[PDB]
């Protein structure tokens, strides 16, 4: 086939001059990425059939009792969650003459590059949900808690950020920080202009960047945590678990047929017919987060949080909305966008008619607001699947 195929690596323009004796080592290489999730989440063992995790749920009780007053009866209760592994894969293909020569160490390089790609795809799927497979039980960006950090990192983390966690009874165990945050851990001064996080003569790194502790909690730095306005996370990373079914399972063939198109628009090639060689790679991962609202999203400067509310086609009733600690008046199940906006500013909160914004109709209400929004469906008389979630940044 032709040189410069987009698919087949075949003695191409890319390798121009590789045979010469003067081609140097790359002096401007970069370190390969490594997943934060695989460093901070506990690695549970699992097989291909997945696992079931039992959970207790009985509010078992006992009563104060008089002389001869007959004792009450009670019983416990239990539930379980399923977890299943997803699968991730790729193939890379080279001409026989390419793999015989291995110019620019292409195959040895490519094996590491697909390994980094698989690891990074797993990490992105766990944090941001981007291309996340249906088997993953939630992703870290879904948290309804956000916190500004830039004015002063200690105030942002240890006071305001922590307040949003303990008010919901959650612990704080780690911080994950994008290494772009260093200019905010620097500065963060006292009123006299000394920085909080470093020594009297400023010789050495601010201690979080030594993988130190912010207050009690270890910190994990990485160069690929941030997306959009979200620059890091704080929470109890004991609430997240993962597993891997087997190693990166590299194998090689040259007799196979491949399709370069879709199944509906196929463009078959035999690897033997044109003398290619192909390497196939696959892995399987399981991932569960017990409560996505247990984390707080660190964000660089003050921002709105945006939500989607689904009424599950409920035919009657009234619901209620709560923003941070405050609660609305009762809201009809089919109310207009202007109606629900008016019910939000009526919460008794510092929010105002120029901040709050809404879009939807009789259901599927998108809303954007500077706080933690949540819903009470107790007065809704139908559609018990009705639910609210964070939907995107912006």
């Amino acid at each position: 086939s032709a040189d410069h195929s987009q698919i087949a690596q075949t003695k191409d323009t890319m390798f121009t001059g590789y045979l010469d004796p003067v081609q140097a080592k790359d002096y401007f290489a970069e370190a390969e990425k490594t997943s934060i999730v695989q460093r901070v989440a506990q690695k549970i063992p699992m097989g291909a059939t997945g696992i079931v995790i039992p959970h207790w749920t009985g509010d078992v009780s006992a009563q104060w009792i008089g002389e001869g007053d007959m004792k009450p009866i009670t019983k416990g209760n239990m539930t379980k969650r399923d977890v299943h592994p997803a699968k991730i894969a790729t193939i890379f293909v080279a001409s026989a003459e390419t793999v015989r020569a291995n110019p620019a160490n292409y195959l040895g390089t490519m094996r590491t590059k697909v390994a980094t790609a698989i690891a990074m795809a797993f990490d992105n799927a766990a944090l941001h949900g981007t291309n996340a497979p249906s088997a993953f039980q939630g992703y870290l960006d879904q948290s309804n808690k956000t916190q500004s950090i830039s004015p002063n990192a200690y105030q942002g983390l240890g006071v305001s950020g922590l307040t949003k966690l303990v008010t919901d009874g959650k612990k704080w165990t780690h911080t994950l920080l994008d290494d772009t945050v260093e200019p905010v851990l620097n500065g963060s001064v006292d009123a006299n202009g000394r920085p909080l996080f470093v020594e009297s003569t400023y010789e050495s790194l601010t201690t979080p960047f030594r993988e130190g502790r912010i207050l009690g909690r270890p910190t994990i730095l990485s160069d690929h945590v941030a997306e959009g306005d979200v620059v890091g996370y704080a929470g109890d990373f004991s609430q997240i678990i993962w597993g891997q079914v087997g190693g990166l399972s590299f194998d090689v063939t040259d007799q196979a047929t491949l399709n370069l198109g879709s199944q509906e628009s196929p463009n078959f090639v035999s690897l033997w017919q044109h003398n290619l060689v192909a390497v196939r790679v696959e892995a399987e991962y399981g991932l569960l987060i017990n409560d996505v609202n247990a984390f707080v999203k660190l964000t660089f400067d003050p921002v709105l949080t945006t939500y989607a509310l689904d009424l599950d086609g409920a035919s009657a009733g009234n619901f209620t909305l709560s923003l941070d600690g405050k609660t609305s008046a009762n809201i009809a199940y089919n109310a207009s966008t202007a109606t629900v906006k008016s019910a939000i500013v009526a919460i008794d909160d510092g929010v105002s008619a120029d901040d709050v914004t809404v879009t939807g109709s009789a259901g599927d209400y998108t809303i954007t607001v500077p706080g933690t929004l949540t819903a009470d469906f107790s007065g809704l008389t139908d559609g018990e699947g009705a639910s609210i979630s964070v939907v995107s940044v912006g």
């Binding site: 026989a96 020569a101 040895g108 094996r111 079914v245 087997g246």
Partner: protein, 450 residues
């Protein structure tokens, strides 16, 4: 210091990366399809009938075939140690371990991988009583691993191994079904797949050094990490011969015979069938073909190619391969003269025999250091400083010209009146240290009668 579960992955990347380099040399010891071997003149459909060329395997065998360790030498302040069976001379304890492990077998394999890829690794451990069913449990388990299964980072400041990993692929060659990581003071292994399917077993050991020694094929000091024995000159003459051998084979399939022609008679005048362009000539011997030849016809033929014209080029490539490898001419050319006398055999073997003795000298230092390291692992104390002076002893690489050696040794000993003591006559005949003790016993049992 680094957390070992992080270090294994860092090592497995370097090990995985290494495979693509050493795979280049592999393709000459096995005659794999190399694209530079394919002769250009044969048409694109005949290119499948690859020729293969045996020089690299002939050479790397013809060295390793000659090598054998016969024992160890250790000096002492006593001036001699008595030959004294299996332990009392410390050299006999080392030779006892050299048989309780079959290192007489695993070395003669291991040197072949050490020549092909340029390195092989000697691994020392105490045996595992739960797994090592078929060893004496009190000797050290000393064993050789090829660079397709072990990798070691060597510090350029010191030439010590910093750490090393031994990784075993499954029966399909795809997944790493276990990894063993050696640290300066500890051995660790993950047992089912990539540490995914088990937690590590561990064992501390009484050393300052990683319990792995590199056998390395070094031609000169500047080979800081050792290099393949299949030299660029042998790769060159091998691929050159592979092209000329294919072009000759293709010639014999197309053109070792004349191609016959006629002009001056249209196909209709021959009675050729119009659909198929041919007529069935009556092919038997001594027919005469009669034609009208109505234009004023004539007959011609293209010549056959002379196959001698390829053959006396292949002569020069075999004679090059002889000079580059230094093999005796009789290893590569049947037209070279067979040596008539033992002196002429010492002439013809000399170029190879010296090079084998270099491999003995250079690999001896690996085994020598492995035994010193085994002594610390078994006995726990510091080594007696005599072991730093120890040396290996090897088989005479040259062919055993016994009838010439016997008349010479007989002349020198002259029934005890002669030049040499009896023992020197036994080493000049080339009897091993292991046989020398049998010689001792059989001589006493003869002198008992007289």
């Amino acid at each position: 210091s680094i957390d070992p579960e992080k270090l294994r992955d860092q090592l497995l990347d370097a090990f995985e990366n290494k495979q693509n380099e050493l795979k280049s040399s592999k393709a000459y010891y096995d005659a794999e399809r190399r694209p530079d071997a394919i002769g250009l003149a044969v048409p694109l459909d005949m290119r499948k009938y690859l020729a293969h060329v045996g020089y690299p395997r002939t050479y790397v065998d013809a060295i390793a075939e000659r090598q054998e360790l016969e024992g160890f030498r250790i000096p002492s302040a006593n001036g001699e140690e008595p030959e004294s069976g299996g332990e009392n001379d410390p050299a006999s304890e080392l030779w006892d371990w050299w048989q309780a492990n079959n290192l007489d077998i695993e070395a003669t394999l291991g040197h072949t991988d050490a020549l092909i890829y340029g390195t092989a690794y000697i691994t020392i451990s105490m045996p595992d009583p739960e797994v090592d069913f078929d060893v004496d449990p009190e000797v050290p388990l000393i064993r050789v691993e090829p660079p397709t299964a072990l990798y070691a980072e060597v510090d350029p400041r010191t030439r010590k191994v910093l750490y090393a990993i031994r990784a075993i692929y499954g029966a399909d060659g795809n997944e790493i079904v276990s990894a063993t990581l050696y640290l300066p003071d500890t051995t660790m292994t993950w047992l089912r797949a990539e540490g995914e399917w088990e937690a590590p077993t561990s064992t501390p050991h009484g050393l300052e050094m990683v319990p792995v020694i590199p056998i390395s094929n070094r031609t000169r000091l500047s080979d800081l990490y050792g290099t393949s024995e299949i030299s660029p000159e042998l790769r060159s003459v091998t691929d050159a011969a592979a092209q000329i051998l294919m072009n000759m084979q293709g010639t014999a399939n197309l053109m070792a015979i004349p191609q016959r022609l006629i002009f001056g008679a249209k196909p209709e005048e021959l009675g050729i069938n119009a659909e198929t362009g041919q007529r069935m000539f009556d092919a038997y011997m001594a027919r005469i073909l009669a034609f009208e030849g109505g234009e004023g016809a004539h007959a011609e033929q293209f010549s056959a190619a002379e196959l001698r014209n390829f053959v006396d080029a292949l002569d020069a490539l075999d004679r090059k391969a002889a000079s580059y490898s230094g093999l005796p001419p009789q290893y590569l050319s049947s037209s070279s003269d067979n040596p008539a006398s033992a002196e002429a055999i010492k002439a013809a073997e000399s170029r190879l025999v010296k090079k084998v003795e270099r491999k003995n000298k250079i690999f001896g230092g690996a085994w020598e250091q492995a035994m010193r390291l085994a002594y610390k692992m078994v006995k726990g104390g510091d080594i007696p400083t005599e072991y730093y002076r120890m040396e290996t002893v090897w088989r005479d690489p040259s062919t055993p010209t016994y009838a010439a050696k016997a008349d010479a040794a007989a002349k020198l000993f002259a029934n005890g009146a002669g030049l040499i003591p009896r023992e020197r006559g036994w080493v000049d005949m080339g009897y091993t240290i292991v046989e020398r003790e049998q010689m001792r016993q059989w001589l006493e049992q003869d002198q008992k009668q007289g």
